[PDB]
């Protein structure tokens, strides 16, 4: 009963660990308990996966007791339950990816509308705050967009976006 | 080139450059008036239809040229042949090898009738000459055409068709002046290890 | 049955584009290496190039800034162009399913394995040629009688492009006995051709050649006499 | 009274061997010639439960074979400091495929003798210049070696059992009316190749496939034939061994000598009994837990260069062979068909064994054109996971913990103590 | 049928040694790997009779521990000529408490090569000047050698039995409720020590007490006990190996280079422990044989230094420490009190072997600040015949004979032979 | 359920012997040392049944020998080049009884180094002038052998009975009515010798006489003995070892120097003790088929030198002594009469081993004054097929295969294995 948020485009790692400081064999499965990584002793196995290209794990911490799982240029579709199988224990951890794309121009003309809409998996309710480049708060839902704006919100725009009492920061530019 | 075979004699058709490397020789046959069909391919592998009556010479030996081998020839086989070679050691041949015309023959002797004419007065009187010389009635379809000015052979503006099935025609376009300035001239045509010479005066 | 059928303008002018479509059926374009090909009149055939839908495709290197082939799924068809085309481009062409093939040896002999290719099925073909002419139309001379008991009379027909020119005797009441000649290509690029009637020498009938051209709309009656 | 797990095995072999090569040299030291029958006797009933995956005595003689290997490193076997840098050059002028080459001959600025002083020497390497070895580099060397697997038979000594279930087709986990109980095993060649068994022992009835657990395809499947299936493999990459002794401290060899200019490194399997194996282990997989499906074979999944390829040795010198000639066949659940198969190799000098103490290197190869013939004996499976809705079943290979390779050998072993 | 004392016994030994030190040659020229098990299976019933000290195997392993000492003597050690005359010195300048010295330096013109030539040569000694070695002297020297136990498993081989008495709390001619049957035991290290067992076994549970006879006093009395106590030796005596090889036949040692100016060589007890075990042993004995008293330890009787002091090895130079610091002790029928021993020591090279058929030396002690942290498992008592009226019980250290330490490891160990 | 006839055996030998000596290599090579124990535990009852000549173990022990022999001619024993010609003289200046020799000094051109060099070397044949060696002759010389049989104790490995007949008297093909069961035998010493057996193991109780068929003359009649026959065979006949080292390939040796012209090779028996076995075995023969006849023993009956003569080792040099004296009664069956006997006897290098392979020569005897004091443990013997009328049953003395050597002291031993 885990969760992790991801951000599209940047690496995650999910992590377990064993109550032996042994290396033993693991396995990672998605939550249709298909492979996407395991070890044969020390050697690494990936599996079948929609990750199998992106998919890694650092060896080092095997021989530790520890075993992680390393996604790198996550998509929004990598969002899943992944488990994994050591010590005849299942840990299950439910990742979340998310990303906000801007609908509107990246030279925005005076007194205009920002537009942005967040991508998410399906079948989630995200919950987003975002901040403008001085001192004012936004609110909203689905597809959040600042109707007015002024010349003085030129600058870095920073925005939350919040799930399961967890939160994580995107930044863009705008001119 | 040409091979001529009576029937149910054997015919051997060569085909392009000597061998250098390994080889995958193809070979096609077209019937007159058709498109190019194919016999072997890989130097010996026959598609379905083809009768083991053809053969071809496999890839082995370096310095020998592709052969196809016909056995039991007959009339239908009256077509001409290609091959397309591949080797290890050239390059991919875009161009096929040189036409071998094979001439079954069933029938022999049949001699030419020839025919031949001075030019129209209607010609002379538009400043302009040909004599026309018409071959016909013979059998096999293979004749040779030359003519002469006097004794001396003409070698410009002769014009000849190919005997088709079978008759044929050439031409010798002159002047008037060049009509007059002879003797006469011939036309002669070879056919089947003899010559036949027509002759036309002034 | 895989069956193939190239189609095609029939006349193009110099320095045109020539493009030909071969409608197929039978087979699925994607599942066959294609082939175009020609054969000029009297000549080899001559392979132009090769195509597959996977981008398996290369040409003749003679032709490779002039000519281009083509896969259409859609319509289930082969298609060619080849720009700048001169009369040296004449040719009846063909379109072929293309089959590939290998030779395969020991590894001791590793560069010596190669690919090959071979035409397994066929098209009819389209001929096409390139020239530069609207029309011409004939001269008819005749060819008088003159010895023999019976004896050849007729008429020389002289000049004319494109092919074909029709000759009747007598507006067709004259057929035993008459040959008309295929046309002689001159080097001039024009064609001429003669006929001939064999009739005896005793002299009671009129005889008149019939000589048409449809391309230049053109029709001639000519007598013949001794 | 029978009691079980103990950390106790006694090491028996020889016949004609003495020290040189490398197995040799481990039978001639842990273990002493073996008494060669054993009586066995199954007596009458005698329990119908055993279990051959929760077996001990395989991490045992796992661990006593790296601890083998270890020792094995300690003296001629040099941990420092040749790998540095790398000026190599291609023998290639003119190319077609983007070839590069696996093999590189180099020239390198080597130490000698004395202070600071050095000479050109030839040397061999994989990738392309400067590069280095990653971390740690551990050349073997060693004047008087080679390595073939010995059998060596494994005992309970002054007082054990080892019990062998004599079941020719047992579960795994399932009932075995005859146990017997044996001094000393047969003798198992320690062999260290992934995906198929080589040299191996042979199932006595018919193609058997063994799980610790069928329904999780993590676990590996292991097969074992009835019937072995041909492979040979051969090298005629040549070099001449050179070994130049300048200074006391440092040894080196010189490679790459000669031409030859062989392809890459090779090998073939004779197909007839591949088709038989395979069309057993097809029909085996559906009256076991596929009854009515196809079942494909695909490929290694990925990973490290030991999983995705047929990872195993012709003589100490690694090799690594294409699997995906042997994983390219559907087998539709109706009648089968002809042709043979060849496979592409690589050779390798470096391995990382143990865990990362270090890379090791079989760095001279000895004379050129070796071929190894083996029997295949089994085959080792990961199941790549399915549906029901596709009306198939996909298998991968498996392997790459060599304990998996021992519990294939160990399938009828395991030691336990006789209270009264 | 059982049937008793026979003489054929077999050795198993090695781990991870070959030559060099005296007992891993005789492991690797008297033994084979042991083979590590024994089901031993105390089956029901089975008598309840056995003596311990009635056991002709102690004689046999004793013998043959000097059979292969007499071996050893045969390849490079040396019987004669150079201990004639010593031209010692003293290393002294200003002295109190007229200590003379113990190990002094000392010259020799010894001979050297051809015929006649002499050299002076460092010598080492243990009493004054002139004084020579008495009778014989065999210096053991020898370029490569140590002297450090290993274990010896013994074994009744292929038909015969060791019968074992597991019994924890045995009376040595009593009953014995738990007999088992085993091939061999479990590995012992000959040490050689007087009064104090070093390394050997320990009790299961409690300290036990055994002797021959009780009422005897000339009997000796062996204590085990359930848990050790440290000791601690260490020489930080220095000296330079020098060996010198000059004519073919000659080759010796010129120990005696660089300094330390150590007092002895010396030892220390942990006192916790000792008095936690001496205390239990005078529990033991009260509710054994001495029901109500007062219970003294004394230091030894009188006698030869192997005698009258703990002698023992520590590398196989032979060791002599004061006794009194272990046996100051009277134990009144109440309670002990805290705190710590050193105790002196001394070495020699010089000891008697055999019975009088000649000395032993070992002559090179090589570097120094030498140490031997070791567990006392053992004592060997006797006890001082005593009267009623003085209310007490006195004991002194004892032994002497090695034998007796063999009792102290065959106490659970009798060879049979088995009929039909 | 016993189950006979398996083709394994162990080895088990050592105590002091090394490398050097031809039958010390093979225990070093074969063996390991040996544990003695057997319980035997002869079961009640078990079977009245057993045929001892049956046994495939005998050929395999033999045949094993014969490949010994043969692996111990692979290094440094020589089949070519130098056997050419002889240039061979006479000692003898004055003759009676026309002598020839048995033994001369000769000379020959032997090459020795570089090419086509040759010096005068000397040489001993046994025969007379040129002659040279018949298809083969391989020179055995090598630095370090020597040739004396050691026991070699077979066993049966690993759980398997040997089944042992301990009976006093068996019949051969007859009832048993103690069989036990045994893991090693006492040692057999390999014995190479013909008509008698020497070294071997001597009757419970009383003299034996097995044969494979009695009623069939053509079987070899064995004949053991509860008393021993004394019998010393010195040769005075004197060489100097000297090998002369001169090329790298080459290696040769020189006989025939010193001086003592002795009697060719003597050998003794004490009729005291051959006097009573064979007078028991005539009683014993009289008592098994020859109830009421006189026995008659005759000299052997012609062929091959080896079938002769009692043909024999005494130390790699192989000996061939008159049967004259041991086969010269008429044993009338009443009385027997005194004295005592000297046999001649001869020696060669040269024996015909294996089949046609090759002759091997033990060409430098070493020393002299070599005396080999045995005895004999057995006889070999064969009836002559003779009439009713002649009241006489004669023997010859026979053997020449030791399969029959090996069933002499095999005959208790058949090895089984065990089913339930």
Same mark, same amino acid.
């Given at each position: ?25 693991? /396995? ?13 002793? &020390? ?9 199998? !290209?992106?998919?890694? +794990? ?29 010590? !005849? ?87 | ?13 060569? =085909? ?7 080889? &995958? ?10 498109? @190019? ?83 129209? #007065? ?47 025609? &050439? ?32 | ?33 294609? $082939? ?24 003749? @290197?003679?032709?490779? $800034? ?16 080849? *720009? ?26 590793? %560069? ?21 002419? +609207? ?66 020498? $005793? ?14 709309? *053109? ?8 | ?11 028996? $072999? ?49 661990? !006593? ?6 020792? &094995? ?9 040749? =790998? ?11 190319? *077609? ?46 004047? %008087? ?32 009316? #005859? ?63 050179? +070994? ?21 490194? /090779? ?42 390829? /047929? ?110």
């Amino acid at each position: 009963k885990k969760v992790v948020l991801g951000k599209k485009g940047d690496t995650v790692e999910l992590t377990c660990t064993a109550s032996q400081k042994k290396s033993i064999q693991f /396995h990672w499965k998605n939550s249709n308990q298909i492979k996407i990584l395991g070890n044969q002793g &020390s050697f690494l196995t990936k599996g079948p996966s929609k990750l199998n !290209d992106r998919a890694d +794990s650092r060896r080092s911490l095997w021989d530790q007791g520890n075993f992680p799982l390393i996604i790198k240029n996550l998509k929004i579709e990598d969002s899943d339950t992944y488990i994994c199988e050591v010590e !005849d224990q299942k840990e299950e951890v439910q990742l979340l990816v998310f990303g906000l794309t801007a609908n509107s121009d990246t030279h925005l003309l005076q007194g205009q509308s920002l537009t942005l809409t967040l991508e998410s998996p399906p079948g989630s309710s995200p919950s987003v705050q975002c901040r403008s480049p001085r001192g004012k708060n936004i609110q909203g839902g689905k597809t959040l967009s600042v109707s007015q704006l002024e010349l003085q919100d030129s600058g870095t725009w920073t925005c939350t976006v919040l799930q399961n009492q967890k939160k994580v920061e995107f930044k863009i530019d705008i001119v | 080139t040409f091979v001529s075979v009576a029937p149910g004699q054997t015919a051997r058709i060569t =085909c392009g450059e000597e061998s250098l490397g390994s080889r &995958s020789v193809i070979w096609y046959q077209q019937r007159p008036g058709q498109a @190019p069909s194919l016999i072997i391919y890989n130097n010996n592998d026959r598609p379905s239809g083809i009768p083991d009556r053809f053969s071809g010479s496999p890839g082995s030996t370096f310095g020998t040229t592709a052969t196809l081998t016909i056995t039991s020839v007959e009339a239908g086989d009256e077509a001409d042949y290609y091959c397309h070679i591949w080797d290890s050691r050239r390059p991919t041949n875009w161009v096929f090898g040189e036409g071998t015309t094979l001439i079954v023959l069933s029938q022999p002797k049949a001699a030419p009738s020839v025919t031949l004419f001075p030019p129209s #007065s209607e010609e002379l009187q538009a400043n302009k000459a040909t004599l026309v010389c018409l071959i016909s009635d013979f059998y096999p379809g293979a004749v040779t055409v030359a003519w002469k000015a006097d004794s001396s052979p003409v070698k410009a503006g002769v014009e000849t068709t190919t005997p088709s099935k079978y008759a044929a025609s &050439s031409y010798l376009s002159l002047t008037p002046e060049q009509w007059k300035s002879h003797k006469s001239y011939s036309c002669q045509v070879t056919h089947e290890g003899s010559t036949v010479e027509k002759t036309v005066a002034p | 049955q895989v069956h193939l059928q190239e189609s095609g303008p029939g006349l193009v002018k110099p320095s045109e584009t020539l493009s030909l479509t071969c409608n197929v059926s039978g087979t699925l374009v994607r599942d066959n290496y294609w $082939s175009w090909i020609r054969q000029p009149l009297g000549k080899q055939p001559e392979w132009i190039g090769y195509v597959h839908d996977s981008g398996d495709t290369n040409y003749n @290197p003679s032709l490779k $800034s002039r000519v281009h082939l083509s896969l259409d799924k859609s319509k289930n068809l082969v298609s060619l162009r080849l *720009t700048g085309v001169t009369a040296a481009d004449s040719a009846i062409y063909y379109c072929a399913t293309t089959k590939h093939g290998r030779r395969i040896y020991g590894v001791v002999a590793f %560069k010596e394995w190669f690919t090959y290719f071979y035409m397994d099925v066929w098209g009819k073909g389209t001929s096409v040629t390139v020239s530069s002419a +609207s029309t011409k139309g004939p001269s008819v001379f005749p060819l008088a009688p003159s010895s023999g008991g019976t004896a050849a009379l007729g008429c020389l027909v002289k000049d004319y492009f494109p092919e074909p020119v029709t000759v009747s005797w007598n507006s067709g009441a004259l057929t035993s006995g008459v040959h008309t000649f295929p046309a002689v290509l001159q080097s001039s690029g024009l064609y001429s051709l003669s006929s001939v009637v064999t009739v005896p020498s $005793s002299g009671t009938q009129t005889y008149i050649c019939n000589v048409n051209h449809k391309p230049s709309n *053109t029709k001639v009656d000519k007598r013949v006499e001794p | 009274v029978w009691k079980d797990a103990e950390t106790t095995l006694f090491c028996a $072999s020889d016949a004609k061997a003495y020290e040189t090569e490398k197995h040799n040299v481990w039978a001639t030291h842990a273990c002493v010639p073996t008494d060669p029958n054993p009586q066995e006797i199954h007596l009458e009933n005698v329990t119908e439960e055993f279990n051959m995956w929760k077996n001990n005595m395989v991490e045992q003689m796992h661990t !006593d074979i790296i601890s083998l290997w270890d020792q &094995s490193l300690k003296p001629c076997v040099k941990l420092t400091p040749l =790998c540095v840098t790398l000026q190599c050059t291609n023998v290639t002028n003119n190319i *077609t495929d983007d070839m590069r080459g696996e093999l590189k001959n180099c020239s390198f600025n080597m130490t000698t003798e004395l202070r600071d002083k050095k000479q050109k020497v030839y040397s061999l390497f994989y990738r392309y210049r400067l590069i280095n070895c990653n971390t740690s580099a551990i050349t073997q060397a060693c004047p %008087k070696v080679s390595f073939e697997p010995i059998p060596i038979h494994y005992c309970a000594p002054a007082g054990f059992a080892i019990l062998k279930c004599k079941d020719k087709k047992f579960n795994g986990t399932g009932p075995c009316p #005859s146990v017997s109980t044996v001094q000393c095993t047969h003798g198992i060649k320690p062999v260290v190749s992934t995906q198929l068994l080589l040299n191996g022992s042979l199932a006595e009835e018919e193609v058997m496939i063994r799980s610790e657990n069928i329904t999780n395809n993590a676990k590996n499947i292991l097969v074992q034939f009835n019937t072995p299936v041909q492979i040979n493999c051969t090298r005629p990459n040549n070099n001449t061994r050179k +070994s130049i002794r300048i200074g006391p401290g440092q040894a080196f060899y010189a490679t790459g000598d000669i031409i030859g200019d062989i392809r890459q490194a /090779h090998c073939n399997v004779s197909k007839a009994t591949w088709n038989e194996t395979l069309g057993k282990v097809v029909k085996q997989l559906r009256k076991h837990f596929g009854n009515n499906t196809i079942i494909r074979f695909a490929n290694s999944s990925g990973g490290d260069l030991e999983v995705t390829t /047929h990872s195993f040795n012709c003589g100490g010198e690694f090799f690594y062979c294409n699997t995906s000639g042997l994983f390219n066949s559907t087998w539709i659940s109706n009648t089968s068909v002809n042709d043979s198969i060849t496979l592409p190799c690589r050779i390798k000098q470096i391995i990382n064994m143990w865990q990362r103490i270090g890379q090791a290197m079989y760095a001279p190869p000895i004379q050129g054109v070796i071929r190894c013939v083996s029997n295949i004996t089994g085959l080792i499976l990961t199941r790549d996971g399915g549906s029901t809705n596709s009306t198939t079943e996909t298998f991968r290979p498996g392997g790459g913990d060599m304990r998996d390779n021992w519990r294939s050998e160990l399938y009828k072993y395991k030691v336990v103590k006789i209270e009264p």
